[PDB]
Design a protein around this ligand. Structure first.
Ligand SMILES: NC(=O)c1ccc[n+]([C@@H]2O[C@H](COP(=O)([O-])OP(=O)(O)OC[C@H]3O[C@@H](n4cnc5c(N)ncnc54)[C@H](O)[C@@H]3O)[C@@H](O)[C@H]2O)c1
Ligand SMILES: NC(=O)c1ccc[n+]([C@@H]2O[C@H](COP(=O)([O-])OP(=O)(O)OC[C@H]3O[C@@H](n4cnc5c(N)ncnc54)[C@H](O)[C@@H]3O)[C@@H](O)[C@H]2O)c1
Ligand SMILES: NC(=O)c1ccc[n+]([C@@H]2O[C@H](COP(=O)([O-])OP(=O)(O)OC[C@H]3O[C@@H](n4cnc5c(N)ncnc54)[C@H](O)[C@@H]3O)[C@@H](O)[C@H]2O)c1
Lengths: 476, 476, 476, 476
């Protein structure tokens, strides 16, 4: 029950950061004021697997101030802010397993430790807060392999590891089963539900739900309007250049920036690059998104067409093998490559790092310089992992306030309906009125005056004076 | 049946414009190349009620080249381009009833004439293309009043006219029933379906469908992605400043522009005003839209807060009484007021024009100068009706190509399934693949290179290499 | 001697436009309020040669309200607004010779008529307001050729006409000398001075002054901060897209726009195209301007590199042969070509129009469609002349207010120092304090609150609390 | 000959940064390739007083590679990058006295140490590179007080210290004179000249030159086009948000940002804030700049009008007392205040820090939180000193390349003309051709293709095919 952090003496620095960011998160603060003295999450055991940053610390503190017990780990080996981990590990009923620059082996250990609440009966959490689906994955795969072992006596061999991170994952599961072949099966049965924060995690849930593999309720927090339209757009508009500037200090204006993918994240990234004066190039597979990109003055092309002159290459597709080895080998000298989508699959950093005749030179934390066979030296950020969270501090508190408000409401609704049959083992979405509520909490801070709908106006539009004001199909 | 247009000698000028805009509508031209020699709409009787512009002429030509017969009218008394009406009235199997500056009495006469195909059995059309729902309204109200007369022997009295335009509407219906009390009831029975082009028309359809008043199938073309995301946004970004410039020639940069409503149209309008250097103020009733407005650098306020210093006031709410008489009376000298939403309800132009001590002075077509009681002189555009179509030429052909492609596909699908039970008396949406198809047709013209999804990438995303690439809930 | 205009019955329409634009020119209106009842220009004879637009009419009215007599003509054969010419010709002591679509022969006739005040002694004006230097040219060339005839008995032969417009010019001078070989020599002697409005006219004056050919004082109004920084930038940002929209109605967003020249005009043009969503490409010869263009996100290339995919080609160089015949022949179908710089030298429209196998088809006034040898049809605006003034109404009133305020001050200072030796036969610039004065007059209209410099702040900066606040070398 | 730096072990980290930034400074690298093996600065003793950053390290290395000996110090107590100082102190013939977070006493010690080359005859440098004029100040004041002491036997008393930093300055001078009352007088006599980098330093030089106090030649590097138009604009566009983000991590979009001053720096700052989506408010004393601000969509107001709702307050005036104590006391909770202009005079941080009832709490390096009397807690950056260099890393290498190229050329020209009478004790500027030269060096890196002027075009414009292309009065 002892937290594991880099250095507990950073707690005060983290505490100061939390106190300040409090004014930047009017949404979360409003939640504490309403459901505060009520303690609606009293006795609830919540395990979280989300970037251990300052904004995340304020989410933890909100959940615990709501009366819940928490075990937490980071969902990325570089996103953890040590001062935030130390500060949060100080709270009562909160245990944390996270630190910056953790190895892949240590990463899975933290996820497992966060999901394990002691031993024996009720060894798992009541609810899960995931960001990418790693905690959810471990549970589902654990249950899957435990059944395979109880039938064919077969264990997950890290031999068939199609990746280094997968090797540690399979190793963790193999050792887990050899210690207690029913651990995950018993835990999964007590889980009320999970709430997914990102597009990638939702994609995983949808595929499991499609094949009826979901063991418990899953709430799609990422598809909430006040999340995908704010977090994914305005957040990346902020943290992309921030991560690029801290990592390289290079000029962006007048430079050729290549953005792969023009969905929510791509739109946000491109907007900030355009405002700085960069020459934006977009790659896309979806014709609808491509036209949106062209209408903003961007040039839509295939990577092969611009890979030779590109100064910055940012992937925001949430797909795999977007920037292949053959592309990296053709880049100009001093080209910068980073991924802001998911894991490290978008860019074949591994293939490049293990290529014959490649020299890897570390410039600073999360920043490496690779010497290509032809002599060109390119820059790779966070070894292909989230550059905004690895080279910077991720989204600003004000943006994360929207996301964490939806997360909190997801946990509240899941816990308050645990004794009902409102939720099955499927993916659900938060109601429309909650989205408007979250938005309403941030209006004052923004000095935005909302107009009151009149009686005639209400009848004409066919809506209530309090909302919702749009239909469920509205795209905003 | 003979066409009724201003001057048929303008046909040549219109013909030249159509030939040129042909290159700007690759979408429509692609349709002619595929379903051309097939004549899928052969023997179909289509009645249209949409702005009679050059872009609309190319839509008519496409429908007739597909084998259909057409009767058409404009949906606005100022939007008709006489040279386009003359040109289209020239085509075989096409009859037109439209001209610029038509009176309200003449307007309804045109709608009725367009919907009436001869006399006796089968006196109505097979399908309807509407833009605002006026044709659809006439038919539904006609059936409603015809039943009221067949039961209580009561006729629609233009006495209870809550408006001048409504007076002519009720007068037209009263006369219609005194001539044939079953005209509309019999016509509504043969209508396969209608396809709505704008947000206002869809709102009308949704309300009727909510109360189960729909007499036939209705396709929501406005809610199609390649329409609400392109037409409503990029179209207005183009035609708002164009309408403002031609009507007043005033400088926009440095001026205080007040935009009411920040939905699709509002976002498009604000983007162009921002690009020109204006100081944009936004009014909103929806908190979610309000935050989007603030995140773009716009100040969100209530009209009462800025009505005194505003230089331009543009309504894009699609609501009623947004700019009341009390607001107009407080505006500065030379302030410009225009509506780009629906009809003339957004702004109380009528209340102002009939106010005691008000002097109305016509400056030029669709532009009037009003002298307020305090002596201030303000400028009102198109008497509160669509300023972009009244003072300019509406959206450009390239944008209308997306909308008209969805319209054509809507007519095609509706006609090809007339003998099936695919569509009931409800509001439907065109399939996802069609939206991507439409987008694909315009990529070449835009020099946009789409990327081909790989085999691994397809399985990972769980989509087909040809699309759709997004889920039905995707907001783009 | 009466005015010569297209149709005097348009006077009322023009009057209405002048009354409204009055609120858009707080600068000129302030001048009338200060030097109004004083009549400082009483008895002064002013000849003007500037675009006869509504904004220009308000300048004429201001000069006459100051007590001067005026004879005016347009400096371009397409820029005249007939309703403005009719309205201004109505004023007392104002004679106008201008109309839209005048032939080159008629053009010079108007210039000569405007410069000729009766007959005999004092046959010329006291001061001149030029825009391009045509009136100034005629006087200088007239004096030059009159001396050549009085010595070698040689006359200007229109045979050596290196251009059609030059032929009419030499023809006019030849006839002028065969009627009175001392007309211009005597007129030039009574001219107090001239004030140049545009960059091109200033270039002409500087070359004459360099070779000591100036016969009278010339004031460089164009190099005035509140002119080149406002008019050339913000004015073009407004009239470029307006001219393009009225002439073609084509979509600009997503289109490839090629701007040649990135000086004051180019910067303004590009800013508007960028705001609309176009993909901007810039051509430059000056490396300093080229970097400015790149830092704004624009791609700097040579015409040859983009002439194949360009949708719009706009020249703003003020140079000759920027877009040669070889370039025009390689343009895509439906490509638009227009000049916004000087005369019709920037684009080789003449070479193209007289090329073998070329078909010219008039679409509408100032808009022609040319069929290239390969079949491609391109659009040419105003036959290579100012597209913003030919296809639209030029800069808005508010922007012209700054230029015309500097013009009025130039005329006032020139007339008030006619009996002094403050000005020689050289090019002078208006003092710094006047530039700030002009700017100050427009602040209230813009709701801009200026800050008052404090006592300590004044000493520190070493400036007066009233200005100037910058040094003469400041670039703003 | 012993450098004084924080930790010499950071040398390798600094070296890696220098090697990378080399590719971002094609201008400086070109200088090394041309005047490299020539060693034009051989035996020259250069003392610099400029922000000891990585970009500065590359400038030092260039000067030494040119054959010069260097002694260097920082011109700000927070701008020094320790890893850069350590790396540069490694070079041969280079001595450095600088470190981050130095006290004011230590600051002047470094300046003095940098200007002192040994002892006895020739105890000073041959040339000086200044940024703010502190080194130049020390020398001029030193000579002034040395004469005052040699006449009235009066010493500079730190009693009359109108500031803490001035106290240390006068103390340094007093001790200097009590040790050798002719030190500075003798040194000033051997100084060939100095080259000023910033607007503030130039203002100081101009005031001395105006009163004939200049002891040696001064080159105004800041007024060079490729410096004020690139560095001051594009550099701040980059380092303003960067400093803001690293110091607070606060969201900028949708926030109210108040920029005081709209000159070169203000224009750059506002452009980046606008691109991020902030609501920009500008304060100005100059009417011309105010109109430029309004034409970009910004609201011009007096501080008193917005000081209550502002979220960020940035001063770019280069003036004194812009944000007084009475303004700071009225700011909202969590408001951020920072100066990017000169020293710490723009904002009365001192008055606030010494105000009764004020609590100062350090959040992190260069970031303090002040509790106001009414309880509001505001954030002050770098205690009123350059926030971009104190909270971040200043301008990016590519921008600094333009500035340092002009510096190098300034040193080269000054040293090559030391035995001539080309330069007097006045302020001079670099020739136009050099500005274009510097620009040309960076075109390739930017993928910008310059167009070659044609023979006819050259004669028409009256310029050489190689430039200059503009007149000295051109404002760009
Ligand atoms: N780092 C952060 O702070 C942050 C914040 C939110 C989301 N994310 C992550 O960002 C990624 C994308 O998120 P999103 O919400 O924008 O989802 P999205 O589905 O809206 O956007 C993905 C886009 O990529 C395009 N695409 C797919 N494969 C492509 C390929 N090979 N080449 C070019 N384009 C391709 C699609 O057409 C689509 O428009 C996910 O991995 C998500 O979880 C990161
Ligand atoms: N003239 C054109 O070319 C054109 C093109 C497309 C749509 N339109 C019309 O524009 C209108 C709006 O269209 P939209 O598609 O943007 O729909 P929308 O529903 O997406 O946008 C309307 C917005 O106005 C807001 N709103 C409603 N009442 C308001 C009030 N009283 N004050 C302030 N804001 C209010 C809503 O919250 C919403 O965000 C409709 O009338 C539609 O038919 C015109
Ligand atoms: N139509 C209008 O409303 C309006 C308003 C103001 C000025 N103008 C005219 O516009 C022209 C330019 O004006 P400006 O004030 O911007 O002057 P400018 O001197 O500031 O700009 C000219 C620019 O063109 C560039 N250039 C020259 N030849 C070139 C070539 N062959 N290719 C590419 N670039 C080239 C120069 O390097 C320079 O940057 C003049 O003709 C002027 O009279 C028209």
């Amino acid at each position: 029950n002892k937290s594991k952090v880099k250095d507990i003496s950073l707690a005060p620095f983290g505490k100061m950061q939390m106190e300040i960011s409090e004014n930047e998160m009017p949404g979360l603060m409003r939640i504490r004021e309403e459901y505060g003295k009520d303690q609606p999450l009293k006795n609830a055991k919540i395990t979280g697997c989300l970037h251990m940053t300052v904004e995340c610390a304020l989410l933890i503190e909100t959940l615990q101030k709501l009366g819940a017990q928490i075990r937490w780990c980071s969902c990325n080996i570089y996103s953890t802010a040590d001062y935030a981990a130390a500060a949060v590990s100080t709270l009562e009923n909160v245990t944390v397993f996270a630190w910056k620059n953790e190895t892949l082996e240590e990463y899975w250990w933290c996820v497992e430790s966060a999901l394990t609440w002691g031993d024996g009966d009720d060894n798992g959490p009541d609810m899960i807060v995931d960001d990418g689906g790693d905690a959810t994955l471990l549970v589902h795969k654990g249950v899957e392999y435990e059944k395979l072992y109880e039938e064919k006596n077969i264990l997950p061999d890290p031999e068939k590891a199609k990746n280094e991170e997968e090797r540690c994952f399979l190793t963790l599961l193999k050792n887990s089963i050899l210690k207690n072949p029913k651990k995950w099966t018993n835990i999964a049965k007590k889980i009320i539900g999970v709430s997914e924060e990102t597009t990638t995690g939702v994609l995983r849930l949808k595929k499991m739900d499609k094949q009826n593999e979901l063991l418990f309720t899953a709430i799609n927090v990422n598809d909430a309007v006040t999340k995908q339209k704010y977090d994914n757009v305005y957040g990346c508009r902020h943290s992309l250049p921030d991560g690029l500037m801290r990592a390289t200090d290079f000029l962006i204006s007048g430079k050729i920036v290549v953005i792969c993918g023009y969905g929510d994240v791509g739109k946000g990234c491109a907007s900030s690059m355009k405002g700085l004066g960069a020459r934006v190039y977009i790659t896309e597979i979806d014709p609808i998104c491509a036209i949106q990109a062209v209408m903003e003055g961007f040039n839509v092309v295939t990577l092969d067409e611009i890979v030779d002159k590109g100064d910055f290459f940012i992937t925001c597709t949430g797909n795999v093998d977007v920037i292949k080895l053959e592309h990296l080998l053709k880049m100009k000298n001093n080209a910068v490559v980073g991924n802001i989508g998911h894991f490290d699959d978008e860019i074949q950093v591994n293939e490049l790092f293990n290529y014959k005749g490649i020299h890897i030179e570390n410039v600073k934390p999360q920043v490496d310089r690779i010497t290509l066979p032809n002599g060109n030296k390119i820059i790779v950020l966070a070894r292909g992992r989230l550059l905004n969270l690895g080279c910077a501090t991720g989204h600003p508190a004000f943006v994360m306030s929207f996301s964490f408000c939806n997360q909190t409401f997801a946990q509240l609704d899941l816990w308050q309906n645990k004794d009902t049959n409102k939720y099955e083992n499927k993916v659900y979405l938060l109601p429309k009125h909650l989205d408007e509520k979250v938005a309403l909490y941030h209006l004052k801070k923004l000095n935005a005056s909302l107009t009151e709908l009149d009686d005639n106006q209400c009848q004409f539009l066919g809506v209530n004076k309090s909302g919702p004001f749009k239909s469920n199909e509205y795209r905003y």
